[PDB]
Design a protein around this ligand. Structure first.
Ligand SMILES: [Fe+3]
Ligand code: NA
Length: 247
C-alpha cells in the first residue's frame, strides 16, 4: 500500500506531463526553435540512461559471459540498436544526430549542444561542459539529475528513472507536440519523422530483479520514477517561463 500510492502518483504525474502547457504554447517557428534548443539536451542525456543499463543488464566485457536475464538483455540491446544506430531513409545515425538534422531543417541553432558534447569528448565533466556553453539553468538541473542517476544511482533506481521518467512518457509527450505541428510537416519534415519514430510487465520484472524483491528497493525504484518525472516537469516549467519572458 506504500507502493500503490507511488504507482498512482506516477499515473497522475504522467497525465500532467503528457498535457504540460508548454506544448500548446509553442505556436510559432521561433518558439519551436527555442523548444528544440532546450529539448536536445534531453535527447542527448537519454543515451546515458540507456548505456548505464546496457552496462548493468548485458555483459560488455572481455571475456564475455551470458547476462543473467535474457529478456532484460534483449530489451536493452533492442533499444541500443534503435537509439544509438537507427536506420533512417537518410542512413544510419543516432537519434541524437537525427535530432540535430531536424534542428537544422527547422533553422534551430545546434551550436550550443555541439560545443557541449565536444567538450565532454575532450574529457570535461557534463556539469562543466553545460556551464561553458551557458546552458539555461533549468537545462542544467535536468541534465545534472540524469547524470547523477547514471553515475550514482543503483540499478533499480536507473530502471525506475528510465521506464517511468522516459520510455513511458516520451510517446505521449511527443504525440501532444506532433499534433500541434503536423500541419507544418512540409517545412519541418525531419522533426515530424523524429517524433513519429517514437510513436510494462517487462519493466516491472527488470525492476523486481534489480530490487531483489525488497520492498524498500521497489519503493526506491518507484521514487526514482517520480523524481525523474518531477525533473521533466521542471524542465518544461523553465522552458515555458523562458518563452513567456522572451515572447
Ligand atoms: Fe529515440
Ligand atoms: Na547494480
Amino acid at each position: 500500500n506504500q507502493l500503490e500510492g507511488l504507482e498512482r502518483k506516477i499515473g497522475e504525474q504522467h497525465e500532467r506531463l503528457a498535457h504540460h502547457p508548454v506544448f500548446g504554447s509553442i505556436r510559432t517557428i521561433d518558439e519551436l526553435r527555442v523548444f528544440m534548443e532546450w529539448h536536445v539536451f534531453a535527447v542527448w542525456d537519454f543515451m546515458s540512461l540507456v548505456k548505464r543499463l546496457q552496462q548493468d543488464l548485458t555483459t560488455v566485457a572481455v571475456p564475455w559471459v551470458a547476462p543473467r536475464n535474457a529478456n532484460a538483455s534483449r530489451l536493452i540491446n533492442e533499444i541500443v540498436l534503435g537509439e544509438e544506430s537507427d536506420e533512417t531513409p537518410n542512413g544510419h545515425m543516432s537519434h541524437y544526430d537525427l535530432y540535430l538534422h531536424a534542428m537544422r531543417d527547422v533553422g534551430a541553432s545546434t551550436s550550443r549542444i555541439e560545443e557541449m558534447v565536444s567538450l565532454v569528448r575532450s574529457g570535461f565533466s557534463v556539469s562543466a561542459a553545460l556551464k561553458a556553453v551557458d546552458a539555461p539553468e533549468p537545462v542544467i538541473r535536468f541534465v545534472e539529475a540524469t547524470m547523477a542517476a547514471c553515475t550514482s544511482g543503483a540499478t533499480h533506481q536507473v530502471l525506475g528513472n528510465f521506464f517511468y521518467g522516459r520510455e513511458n512518457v516520451i510517446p505521449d509527450m511527443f504525440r501532444t507536440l506532433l499534433d500541434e505541428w503536423k500541419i507544418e510537416r512540409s517545412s519541418i519534415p525531419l522533426l515530424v519523422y523524429y517524433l513519429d519514430r517514437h510513436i510494462g510487465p517487462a519493466a516491472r520484472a527488470m525492476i523486481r530483479e534489480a530490487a531483489d524483491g525488497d520492498a524498500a528497493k521497489l519503493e526506491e525504484a518507484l521514487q526514482a520514477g517520480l523524481d525523474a518525472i518531477d525533473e521533466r516537469m521542471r524542465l518544461w516549467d523553465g522552458l515555458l517561463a523562458h518563452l513567456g519572458q522572451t515572447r
